[PDB]
Design a protein around this ligand. Structure first.
Ligand code: A1H5Y
Ligand code: CA
Ligand code: CA
Ligand code: CA
Length: 132
């Protein structure tokens, strides 16, 4: 018994996987569902720091499970939860700026950026860990 599948990273009771290929945002959603997971929804500050550190160090622009597709300016996680004010600090300076219509969120450098949902990027999936 081990808590996460091979190649997944254990952190505080959940398992995380960063892709080695790039897809657009909607195709990334489907990729996580195909392995019984979810395009990452962030629930705590410590979790955000953990994920941001990995995107930063690897120098990979990476989708998360957050968009304002349904209502411009209203950001919502893919599990339906709203983006809380305690998370606004994580947007990069000047973001979200919707330049050329940008409705999907990514890890970019030290913070978050809104980018075009049709652009191919890396992605991170999340699923709960097994108890042993
Ligand atoms: O990971 C993304 C990477 O850091 C590059 O980020 C920049 O390009 C992204 C994609 O266009 C923007 O989403 C982002 O906001 C930022 N940008 C672009 C502009 C901008 C303003 C006026 C005209 C043209 C471009 N301002 N910021
Ligand atoms: Ca929009
Ligand atoms: Ca937008
Ligand atoms: Ca942007």
């Amino acid at each position: 018994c081990h808590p996460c599948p091979w190649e997944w990273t254990f952190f505080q009771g959940n398992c995380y996987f960063m892709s080695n290929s790039q897809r657009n945002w909607h195709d990334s959603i489907t990729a996580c569902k195909e392995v019984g997971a979810q395009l990452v929804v962030i629930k705590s500050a410590e979790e955000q720091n953990f994920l941001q550190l990995q995107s930063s160090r690897s120098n990979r622009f990476t989708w998360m499970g957050l968009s304002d597709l349904n209502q411009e300016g209203t950001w919502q996680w893919v599990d339906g939860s709203p983006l809380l004010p305690s998370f606004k600090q994580y947007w990069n300076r000047g973001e979200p700026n919707n330049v050329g219509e940008e409705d999907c969120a990514e890890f970019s450098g030290n913070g978050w950026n809104d980018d075009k949902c049709n652009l191919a990027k890396f992605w991170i999936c999340k699923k709960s860990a097994a108890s042993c």
